[PDB]
Structure 1
Amino acid sequence: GLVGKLVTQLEVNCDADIFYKIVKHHEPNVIPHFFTGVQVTKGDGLVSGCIKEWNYVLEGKAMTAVEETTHADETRTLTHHITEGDAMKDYKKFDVIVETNPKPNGHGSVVTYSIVYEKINEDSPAPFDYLKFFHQNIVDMSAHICSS
């Protein structure tokens, strides 16, 4: 079993469009990390995404990744496409999709982080360490937001 998807989904008490705009422009200073890179424009000169080389520590180990980020405001979706780095030692493909939708309910939101992956071989782990990291990051972010 080489192709798979891991998901964490969380309910948040926040309008979906508002929350998407917050996620779009905000990424946990206690965790060691920084990036360098560039922004990407669409042709009208407005930034449409970015390409970042990250340096970060995951479960104690220093790592690097190169990620291209795109967004879809119409569907409140952010897509992170990893092309290089430590994760590519385990995965042929590694993409992180973040979606925010109103609860069928109506008022609050459901945020979904999906990691869509293809392992290099059967001996590769599934990216549970990344899922927990992304989960804790969005829980941390959401805990700094309140009504009104």
Structure 2
Amino acid sequence: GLVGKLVTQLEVNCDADIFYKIVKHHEEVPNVIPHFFTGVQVTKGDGLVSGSIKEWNYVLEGKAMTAVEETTHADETRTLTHHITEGDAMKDYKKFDVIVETNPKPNGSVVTYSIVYEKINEDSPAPFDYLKFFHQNIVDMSAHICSS
């Protein structure tokens, strides 16, 4: 009950490496949803950007919220990670991390969004509201991509 993971996995008709590069450089929130962020980019030492630290302001199921999150990526495994350190979600969770992976189908690709969480206590909900939000956002992004 206290430690868990929620996952939404979707099949997309796109090469895994190409789709990963699309997800990596696209804002995961459509413009119709109220949101913006401020923050910084993170570099690795050679001066190239390797990630970001952002304070998001967004509206989820009608309620305005804030989150501070550090994003990192691993190109070799086509994995993006968002590590939330502060904000409304931290009233419910001791830990809240969002992991986005893209892999070729064993046969297009499979995209997996995982929310790895630890609740503050048993009265805390599991993050189904966030899972649906991330799901609908990635479906919206994928609906605007097509072949050729």
TM over 0.5: yes
Give a deviation string over 1:108-145, Cα, whole Å, max 9, x none. Answer: 00000000000000000000000000000000000000
Give a deviation string over 1:63-92, Cα, whole Å, max 9, x none. Answer: 000000000000000000000000000000
Q: How big is the shift at 1:14?
A: 0.1
Q: How big is the shift at 1:50?
A: 0.1
Distance (whole Å) between structure 2 residues aligned to residue 76 and residue 59 of structure 1: 30
Aligned residues: 145
Distance (whole Å) between structure 2 residues aligned to residue 57 and residue 30 of structure 1: 11
Structure 2 counterpart of 1:82: 84
Q: How big is the shift at 1:51?
A: 0.1
Q: How big is the shift at 1:32?
A: 0.1
Distance (whole Å) between structure 2 residues aligned to residue 92 and residue 136 of structure 1: 25
Q: How big is the shift at 1:6?
A: 0.1
Structure 1 counterpart of 2:17: 17
Q: How big is the shift at 1:9?
A: 0.1
Distance (whole Å) between structure 1 residues aligned to residue 69 and residue 37 of structure 2: 10
* Secondary structure, aligned partner of 2:121: coil
* Secondary structure, aligned partner of 2:126: coil
Whether 1:97 and 2:112 are equivalent positions in the alignment is no
Distance (whole Å) between structure 1 residues aligned to residue 47 and residue 57 of structure 2: 28
Percent identity of equivalent pairs: 99
Distance (whole Å) between structure 1 residues aligned to residue 62 and residue 124 of structure 2: 19
Distance (whole Å) between structure 2 residues aligned to residue 137 and residue 21 of structure 1: 16
Runs of 4+ in structure 1 deviating by more than 2 angstroms, as ranges, are none
* Secondary structure, aligned partner of 1:132: helix
Compute the RMSD of aligned alpha carbons: 0.2
Listed as ranges, the gaps of 5+ residues in structure 1 are none
Q: How big is the shift at 1:10?
A: 0.1
TM-score (norm 1): 0.98
Distance (whole Å) between structure 2 residues aligned to residue 79 and residue 88 of structure 1: 17
Distance (whole Å) between structure 2 residues aligned to residue 36 and residue 22 of structure 1: 21
Listed as ranges, the gaps of 5+ residues in structure 2 are none
